[PDB]
Amino acid sequence: EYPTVSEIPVGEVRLYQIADGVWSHIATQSFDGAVYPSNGLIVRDGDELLLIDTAWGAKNTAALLAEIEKQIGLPVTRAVSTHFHDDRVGGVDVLRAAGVATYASPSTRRLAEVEGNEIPTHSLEGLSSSGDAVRFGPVELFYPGAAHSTDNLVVYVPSASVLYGGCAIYELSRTSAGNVADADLAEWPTSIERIQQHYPEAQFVIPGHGLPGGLDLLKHTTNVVKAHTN
Ligand SMILES: O=S(=O)(NCc1n[nH]nc1CNC1CCCCC1)c1cc(Cl)ccc1Cl
Numbered sequence: 001e002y003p004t005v006s007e008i009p010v011g012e013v014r015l016y017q018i019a020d021g022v023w024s025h026i027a028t029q030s031f032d033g034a035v036y037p038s039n040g041l042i043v044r045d046g047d048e049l050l051l052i053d054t055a056w057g058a059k060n061t062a063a064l065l066a067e068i069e070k071q072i073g074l075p076v077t078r079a080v081s082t083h084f085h086d087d088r089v090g091g092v093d094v095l096r097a098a099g100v101a102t103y104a105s106p107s108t109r110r111l112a113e114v115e116g117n118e119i120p121t122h123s124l125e126g127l128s129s130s131g132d133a134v135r136f137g138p139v140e141l142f143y144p145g146a147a148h149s150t151d152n153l154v155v156y157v158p159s160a161s162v163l164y165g166g167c168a169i170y171e172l173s174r175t176s177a178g179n180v181a182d183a184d185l186a187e188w189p190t191s192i193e194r195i196q197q198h199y200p201e202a203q204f205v206i207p208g209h210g211l212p213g214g215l216d217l218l219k220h221t222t223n224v225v226k227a228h229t230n
Pocket residue numbers: 031036085086087148167177178179180208209
């Protein structure tokens with residue numbers, strides 16, 4: 001039932017219902033000779049929608065907006081990017097042109113600029129130090145510390161017990177880190193420990209790439225990261 005990489009042509013976007021008023025979006029993109037799936041989140045925000053992460057590119061993000069209109073039918077008014085990589089910010093220009101106010105931490109915005117990526121318009125305050133949390137409409141934004149990247153955020157939807165871990169959390173079948181370029185492998189386990197302490201009632205845990213799971217994904221990710229470290 002959760003769509004997989006070989007089921008989604010590049011340029012198409014699927015939506016998956018996680019709970020009332022909470023969906024993931026799933027897209028695919030070609031990178032370095034392979035095609036990968038990627039997830040984000042959509043959360044009902046009253047009569048509007050909050051988007052977490054782009055669909056990894058301008059064309060995909062346009063398809064995301066079209067699918068949202070067709071399937072959900074409320075406007076996206078705000079978006080948050082959970083770190084600076086193109087799977088998170090690529091498509092912010094389409095979002096802005098569609099009327100969406102785009103947000104990221106000050107660090108994410110600076111990192112995206114230096115990388116040559118699109119830059120969310122607005123800075124999120126109150127997220128500069130590990131352990132910082134802020135409310136943003138129907139979600140809590142949390143900076144757990146460096147992990148997959150120095151700037152990575154996670155997102156919790158309290159009304160639904162959904163934790164969106166983004167690229168800091170691996171799907172269960174994933175047994176290797178792949179590219180660790182921008183990661184802080186020494187810090188990552190401690191960042192995950194912060195997440196576990198802050199969100200012990202999470203029921204659904206959504207990774208940045210691959211299948212949803214539960215809080216088991218936290219220990220799993222720690223195991224993979226430590227194994228690479230050695
Ligand atoms: O090489 S990977 O196996 N591991 C690194 C990784 N972990 N989490 N996200 C990423 C990819 N990050 C990038 C950075 C630059 C632009 C696009 C995405 C991978 C590679 C791809 Cl391109 C998408 C999925 C995976 Cl899972």
